Amino acid sequence: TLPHFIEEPEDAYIIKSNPIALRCKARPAMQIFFKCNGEWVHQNEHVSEESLDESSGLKVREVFINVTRQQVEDFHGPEDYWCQCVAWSHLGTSKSRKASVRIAYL
Amino acid sequence: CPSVCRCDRNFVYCNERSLTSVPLGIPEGVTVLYLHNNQINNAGFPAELHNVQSVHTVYLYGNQLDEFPMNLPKNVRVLHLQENNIQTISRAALAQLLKLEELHLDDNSISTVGVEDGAFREAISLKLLFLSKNHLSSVPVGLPVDLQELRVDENRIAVISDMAFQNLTSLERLIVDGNLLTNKGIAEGTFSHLTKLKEFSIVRNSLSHPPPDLPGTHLIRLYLQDNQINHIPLTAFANLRKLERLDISNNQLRMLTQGVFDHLSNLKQLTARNNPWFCDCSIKWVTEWLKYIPSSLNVRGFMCQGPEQVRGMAVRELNMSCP
Numbered sequence: 001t002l003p004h005f006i007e008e009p010e011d012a013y014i015i016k017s018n019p020i021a022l023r024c025k026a027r028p029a030m031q032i033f034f035k036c037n038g039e040w041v042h043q044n045e046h047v048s049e050e051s052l053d054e055s056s057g058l059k060v061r062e063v064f065i066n067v068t069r070q071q072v073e074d075f076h077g078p079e080d081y082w083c084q085c086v087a088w089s090h091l092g093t094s095k096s097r098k099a100s101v102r103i104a105y106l
Numbered sequence: 107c108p109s110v111c112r113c114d115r116n117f118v119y120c121n122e123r124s125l126t127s128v129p130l131g132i133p134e135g136v137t138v139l140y141l142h143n144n145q146i147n148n149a150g151f152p153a154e155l156h157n158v159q160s161v162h163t164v165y166l167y168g169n170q171l172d173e174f175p176m177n178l179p180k181n182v183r184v185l186h187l188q189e190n191n192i193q194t195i196s197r198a199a200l201a202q203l204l205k206l207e208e209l210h211l212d213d214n215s216i217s218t219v220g221v222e223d224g225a226f227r228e229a230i231s232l233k234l235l236f237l238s239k240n241h242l243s244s245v246p247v248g249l250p251v252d253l254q255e256l257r258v259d260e261n262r263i264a265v266i267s268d269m270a271f272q273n274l275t276s277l278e279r280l281i282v283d284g285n286l287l288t289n290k291g292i293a294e295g296t297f298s299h300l301t302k303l304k305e306f307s308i309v310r311n312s313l314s315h316p317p318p319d320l321p322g323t324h325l326i327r328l329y330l331q332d333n334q335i336n337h338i339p340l341t342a343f344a345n346l347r348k349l350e351r352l353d354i355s356n357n358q359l360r361m362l363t364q365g366v367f368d369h370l371s372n373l374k375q376l377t378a379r380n381n382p383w384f385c386d387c388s389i390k391w392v393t394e395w396l397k398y399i400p401s402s403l404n405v406r407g408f409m410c411q412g413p414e415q416v417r418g419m420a421v422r423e424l425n426m427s428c429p
Contacts, residue, residue: 031243031262033262033286038213038239039260039284040260040284040285042310043312086215086241086262088217088243088262091219092193092217092219093193093215093217093219093220093241095241
């Protein structure tokens with residue numbers, strides 16, 4: 001079957017410059033990559049977790065990427081900085097929702 | 107002409123009308139068909155649309171399509187299918203468009219499994235194929251012979267087969283940049299048979315060294331930017347005599363082997379910016395090469411990053427510390 005997301009990336013806010021993290025979890029998944037602003041995020045920036053599901057023999061994959069205050073202020077696009085999670089299965093692909101990341105001042 | 111869709115000067119304007127399907131009332135003698143910025147689904151294409159032979163340019167960008175459209179006009183040359191959600195590429199759909207010359211499948215969810223074995227090969231007239239920003243894991247094997255430009259940039263490609271570029275002798279431009287591609291991932295002698303290739307780009311990838319066995323029969327531009335290139339072999343730049351522009355910037359290069367640009371006689375520009383060049387007796391030849399090189403060659407980015415005694419200075423302006 002196609003991958004179903006257990007956890008999709010949530011809309012995040014950067015307050016007091018601390019870099020945020022975007023979470024993604026899909027099953028069945030052999031490979032998971034993040035795409036930010038229509039461009040693929042480098043493999044080295046991904047922190048992956050591959051675990052065998054206690055329920056079925058299907059492989060569960062969890063991936064995290066960090067987004068800094070610098071990355072958001074350096075990006076000059078018509079819309080807010082966004083990241084999408086793409087999961088890979090033995091037979092196909094599945095794309096998660098577009099998660100927005102905006103800077104917020106107190 | 108349709109009820110909701112307007113037509114002017116033999117051009118059909120169905121764009122920005124929120125159409126669920128492609129309209130039935132398409133005239134026999136129309137030049138360009140506009141169906142972009144709508145909510146057209148994959149099962150919204152009538153068989154009568156394929157019967158129209160006058161149309162050669164069709165715009166279908168920003169739709170709700172999931173597969174490659176069927177029953178498209180028979181003699182269409184240029185086809186735009188960007189900004190939609192295409193995942194599956196069928197062999198039967200590309201067999202219909204026998205006169206297809208230009209194809210744009212940008213900003214889609216196209217994967218390796220989605221592309222049927224030899225689907226693109228069916229489009230016999232295909233000269234330009236733009237597979238930019240897709241979820242493709244590798245370069246498809248079944249490609250057209252008459253292809254001149256293959257732009258498969260910003261994908262999830264890690265492997266390239268030796269049979270992937272079979273019979274493609276007419277290809278001029280190959281852009282495989284912004285991928286998860288490695289030197290072990292690419293097969294031995296995969297690019298060797300690309301005789302008419304003039305440009306090659308592999309920026310933002312994970313290559314430890316430049317691709318081995320590259321043809322220099324017509325190669326002019328070679329882009330090896332933003333890679334993990336640590337070393338460059340002595341035979342890598344050899345047999346590429348017609349090369350004019352070269353870029354080795356933003357890599358993990360410490361030094362260059364003596365006699366690497368020796369075969370590059372028609373060279374015009376070289377860029378090696380953002381590289382950790384260790385300035386010792388290893389770069390002695392680079393200093394001497396830059397001193398005797400003619401003004402025709404535009405060399406930039408040769409600066410010392412180490413040691414602290416030499417740091418900041420340009421390689422060309424140096425003097426040696428050692429014999």
